[PDB]
Nucleic acid binder design. Structure first.
Length: 89
DNA sequence: CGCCCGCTTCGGGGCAACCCTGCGTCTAATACAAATCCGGCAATGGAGTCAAGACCAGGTTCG
């Protein structure tokens, strides 16, 4: 389980993210899931920073780092002839 | 007169090329070492700056 989790931390993302940032991102996701099931709504980021013993700007930095990239090979418009990369100035 | 045996003819199978009847959350850390950022003095040394101050040369004024 150690080697499988380490390989999932290494190779499962497009841009590479180190192990401790992956750990705190998964911690943030688990705590947000628990607070969503408990409170019933989406938690405030200051409440998340209160829960995770860190600062809300660090919470915002982690939420910025967690954003996976989107692909350029889908169809934006109704017709499939228009790919996504043909509307980027 | 009947009989084998490959040659051609069609069937069926098999396969290659395109769409949606397609389109999940997961142990959890510690310990340590190396690399790197960065913050703050601590030597500068060269490059810019102010000011004096001298250098005549030819208009300009005066004799």
């Amino acid at each position: 389980r150690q080697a499988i989790t380490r390989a999932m931390a290494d190779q499962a993302r497009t841009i590479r993210i180190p192990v401790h940032m992956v750990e705190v991102i998964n911690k943030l996701g688990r705590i947000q899931r628990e607070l969503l099931q408990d409170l019933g709504r989406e938690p405030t980021p200051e409440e998340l920073a209160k829960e995770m013993d860190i600062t809300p700007e660090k919470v915002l930095e982690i939420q910025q780092y967690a954003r996976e990239p989107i692909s350029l090979d889908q169809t934006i418009g109704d017709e499939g002839d228009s790919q996504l990369g043909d509307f980027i100035e």
